[PDB]
């Protein structure tokens, strides 16, 4: 349960280009510091670099909606990578089942545009319903938006924990 | 260059003997 | 000559998917926007001048489908297109704003309203305002997110280079930014003024002479709509600047509007160009869309002669008007200049002045001839000393004035002196402002603008079919999707009949075929008929016409009187 050593193990696995194990140990490191994500993961553990490495791990595994979700974890949300990954059509994750974990309205706007552009009307309506939550309204008070982001963070990270270990 | 004076102005400019004044009023007409 | 009595109300409705956010009202941002347009027209209709208002609709879609209601689209079409907007795209604010301004400037070169190279005529105006309704969500493209507003320059309109901005003199951009939260805001309904929004559209709004509105309550929405209805005016935005020292302040620089009052607006003197014309320039210098007008806070005398045609334009309320009416000097005026309008002078000669009204209720701009302090004494002496019988010294002084007098003023000056009663004062000759190459270029631009206007106006109908397909990946063929136009002719096509409905519908079509003896052989009942659009559902006025007439004998609405 030493998160520093777990991060070192994950980094080793990442440099060796085995990304499932890297995600395993990164999620283990996050789980240690937050009691299985019941609290917020400290920024000193999940830095922008660690989050970027998990993003690359997810992209290399063709879990592109997970890339889109993880892109929201950064201090400055990386729309470039999120939009590039959502364009992919060989996704190996649940796709629309993961839209519940998206709190950024920009990502959902892109998802709606992308599904409309492809005639995927059912997923388009799922994304439009996701936008239409009053919880996710961008002009809500900042504490409400922060709490929405935090509960989605916790749920997504626990889902990833179950998926990867 | 009024709508009721477009033809009148371009005709007076034509009668004045100026070969270039008519072209200016033609655009307005 | 130009109809300024038919204002254009272009609505640039944000149709990005971010407008699917739900307010505390339970409706989406797009529903709020449609209701805002409807409320805007309900408020506008109270004004009797509202008749002849052109309503236009542009969205954030691609250019073939961005224009829903453009030129020569009637009100019912506008309503039908507004009702059926869907928010399913990206926040292409810059591109959609560019298309909206191109739509507004579609017919400018055909009708020569811009008056390029011949002075800027405030009475050559087609007053329009763009009311863009959006949210503060960041701008998006396929590549990523744009942190700032930048209007694209690709695919330039013919003659777009003549004015260095897309927006024009008689166009103003207003933003209705919806910040309505999903929770019932605890703030009271304070009667304060509407805040300026901090989104990327606010600089463009302020530059055009408009302003942005931040909305986070239905009460605030009503307040902005009322103020917007009050801001539908026929006028041109002037970039007023201060020249010289004081007699970094709000009244030093302002993009205020000067009112133009029709009856067909009438005017004589143009605003000077920002350059000295010459007959050897292959190309015309580009124009600022808002002329940089410089005033000197000197309090000169507002000289006027009796019979002169002078154009008077009432400034809208602004900090500059506040300053002028606060110094309280209605008997004095500030001389007004256009920089680089002269042959040599950087500041140039005056062409007008700001003179506060007698009641100190408004400030009016008096557009005089170019370099009027020199011309007006001479013009008075023409009719006071020798009764329009010019002398040698007077003609010499007049010619000397003509050397500093731009050629584009020659036509208005000729018309003015003619209507005083001295038609033979000057040579009746064409204006020397423009070279032959410039005029040929202008006519070519007029033809190209005519062709492009014809193409665009015919393209607003959206006469195309959406790509109803799922491009099948290998690891050509596509999977079709349902369409609106494929109404099931179940009687005429056996493939539209579901298996579960096969037997009873077989009975129905059999009866429809055989029992048509002294009956009617229509298509499928309950579909082709009784699935009428809801608008025509209870149109009894239209329905009664198709029935034979009878014999003569002698809270708002509930579907009838």
PDB file of C-alpha atoms in Angstrom, chain C residues 21 23 55 85 167 170 174 180 199 215 344 420 424-425 519 542:
ATOM      1  CA  UNK C  21     -28.735  22.504 -20.965  1.00  0.00           C
ATOM      2  CA  UNK C  23     -32.728  25.719 -16.732  1.00  0.00           C
ATOM      3  CA  UNK C  55     -36.956  38.710 -39.654  1.00  0.00           C
ATOM      4  CA  UNK C  85     -34.507  24.260 -34.547  1.00  0.00           C
ATOM      5  CA  UNK C 167     -19.753  43.965 -40.236  1.00  0.00           C
ATOM      6  CA  UNK C 170     -25.587  50.062 -40.373  1.00  0.00           C
ATOM      7  CA  UNK C 174     -26.199  42.056 -29.733  1.00  0.00           C
ATOM      8  CA  UNK C 180     -29.729  30.420 -16.392  1.00  0.00           C
ATOM      9  CA  UNK C 199     -17.785  35.619 -23.044  1.00  0.00           C
ATOM     10  CA  UNK C 215     -29.201  36.501 -18.478  1.00  0.00           C
ATOM     11  CA  UNK C 344      -1.729  66.776 -47.098  1.00  0.00           C
ATOM     12  CA  UNK C 420     -29.899  77.462 -54.114  1.00  0.00           C
ATOM     13  CA  UNK C 424     -24.034  77.277 -63.736  1.00  0.00           C
ATOM     14  CA  UNK C 425     -21.503  77.866 -60.952  1.00  0.00           C
ATOM     15  CA  UNK C 519     -67.059   4.954 -53.026  1.00  0.00           C
ATOM     16  CA  UNK C 542     -60.018  27.070 -44.594  1.00  0.00           C
TER      17      UNK C 542
END
